[PDB]
């Protein structure tokens, strides 16, 4: 619809059904996933992060993205270094993997961000609105599987302690959005870039699968 919340939620729900459909997602939803498939995924978002979250403080005054600048809220860097740490140990920076699926992942965030700001609100989207809904579901699911030890560490990238009510702040951020001025061009651009950033997803999540199965 008009509204660029509801335009993106319209076009990207057919790559949000093919995520729902893959292999890892089917496997992680049904409590499948292994402490080495977990500590992927979290490898994973990590870099992902790491790059979203630089080019979102390079762009972070610009008109084209200050008004959906949320860092305290939503920052997830600093949370996936403390997950890290635990999932891989003191040397963790030195021995997480970084396979081609995140790295064309991470090369497309800094092309964005450095080239094309105007379409970063695409990526942080696909990220933190996706990375909010999996509530107290998701989490367990996850904690079920992995039988962690009670040492208070690792999960907390789940938690974004910054948002009491993920509706409140969901509605807020759409709000957001559709506050950003763009061109018909440009909105057509944001639009193919959120469904670019889901391909991206399924990509990773098709490597994944595959390391997994070696
Ligand atoms: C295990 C597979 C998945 C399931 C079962 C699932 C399910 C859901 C559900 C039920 C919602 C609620 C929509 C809302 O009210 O906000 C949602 C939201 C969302 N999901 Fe997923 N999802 C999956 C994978 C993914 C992946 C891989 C991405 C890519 C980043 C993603 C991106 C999003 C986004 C951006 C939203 C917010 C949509 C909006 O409100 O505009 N999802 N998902
Ligand atoms: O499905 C999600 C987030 N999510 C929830 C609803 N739509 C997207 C992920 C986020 C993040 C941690 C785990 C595995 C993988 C990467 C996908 C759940």
């Not at 989490?139 to 938690?159: H, N």
């Amino acid at each position: 619809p008009q509204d660029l919340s509801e335009a993106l939620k319209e076009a990207t729900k057919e790559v949000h059904t093919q995520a729902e459909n893959a292999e890892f997602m089917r496997n992680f939803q049904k409590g499948q996933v292994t402490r080495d498939g977990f500590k992927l995924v979290m490898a994973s978002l990590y870099h992902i992060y790491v790059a979203l979250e630089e080019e979102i403080e390079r762009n972070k005054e610009s008109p084209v993205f200050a008004p959906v600048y949320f860092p305290e809220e939503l920052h997830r860097k600093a949370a996936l270094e403390q997950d890290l740490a635990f999932w891989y140990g003191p040397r963790w920076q030195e021995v997480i993997p970084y396979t081609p699926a995140m790295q064309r992942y991470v090369k497309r965030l800094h092309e964005v961000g450095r080239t094309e700001p105007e379409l970063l609100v695409a990526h942080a989207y696909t990220r933190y609105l996706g990375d909010l809904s999996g509530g107290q579901v998701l989490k367990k699911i996850a904690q079920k599987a992995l039988d962690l030890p009670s040492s208070g560490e690792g999960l907390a990238f789940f938690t974004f302690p910054n948002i009491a009510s993920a509706t409140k702040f969901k509605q807020l951020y759409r709000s957001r959005m559709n506050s950003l001025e763009m061109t018909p061009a440009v909105r057509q651009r944001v639009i193919e870039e959120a469904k670019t950033a889901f391909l991206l997803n399924i990509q990773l999540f098709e490597e994944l699968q595959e390391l997994l199965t070696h």
